[PDB]
Task: inverse folding
């Protein structure tokens, strides 16, 4: 890049269905993909899972 | 047939090959530098990506330098007037066409680096238009080389 400066860790939050599959890499699980495949393998993937509350 | 005032035209052809290509390259470098130094204040990461109009301007001055050196190494005191006329034509052919190529490179480069920070896809269009603008000086280089190849061919 050069249209923006970053020098501090940036985050993207995703949520996906747990049955999902990437079509940029078929034959992969989403979790396995984040670590290995995603941006040259240099992605740090962190847990962010939360459970059910009570829905009206 | 080979008079005394004959290397005057060759000296003017050796001067005008580098003078007008340097004027064109100087217009291109000035316009593109005003563009870069106003578009890379906020986007400094693509500074070294935008120096390509300035390089395309400098290749025009290199084109003028090559023709001026080749005309310089064919001068002489007792040369023909035909040789002086061909060297004048070969100097003007590269000079006043590299001037136009430098005008085009400066205008296209300014307008392309001022808008390539907004749209990142415009860079491969700016490079493509600057190729057509630099082939304008390459044509004058080809005409100057083909003239200077015949400056001393069948000369008495």
Result:
């Amino acid at each position: 890049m050069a249209t923006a400066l970053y020098t501090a860790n940036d985050f993207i939050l995703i949520s996906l269905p747990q049955n999902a599959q990437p079509v940029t890499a078929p034959g992969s699980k989403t979790d396995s993909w984040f670590n290995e495949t995603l941006i040259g393998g240099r992605a740090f993937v962190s847990d962010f899972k939360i459970p059910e509350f009570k829905i009206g | 047939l080979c008079p005394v005032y004959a290397p005057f035209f060759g000296a003017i052809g050796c001067a005008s090959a580098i003078i007008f290509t340097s004027l064109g390259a100087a217009y291109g470098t000035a316009k593109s530098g005003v563009g870069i130094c106003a578009t890379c204040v906020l986007r400094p990461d693509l500074l070294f990506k935008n120096i390509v109009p300035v390089i395309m301007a400098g290749i025009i001055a290199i084109y003028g330098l090559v023709v001026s050196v080749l005309v310089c190494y064919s001068l002489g005191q007792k040369q023909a007037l035909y040789t002086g006329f061909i060297q004048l034509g070969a100097g003007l052919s590269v000079g006043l066409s590299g001037l136009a190529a430098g005008f085009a490179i400066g205008i296209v480069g300014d307008a392309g680096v001022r808008g390539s920070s907004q749209q990142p896809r415009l860079f491969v269009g700016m490079i493509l238009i600057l190729i057509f603008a630099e082939v304008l000086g390459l044509y004058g280089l080809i005409v100057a080389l083909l003239l200077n190849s015949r400056a001393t061919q069948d000369v008495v």
Q: What stands out?
A: The radius of gyration of chain A is 15 Å. Chain A touches chain B at residues 1-5 (CB under 8 Å). Chain A has one helix and no strands.
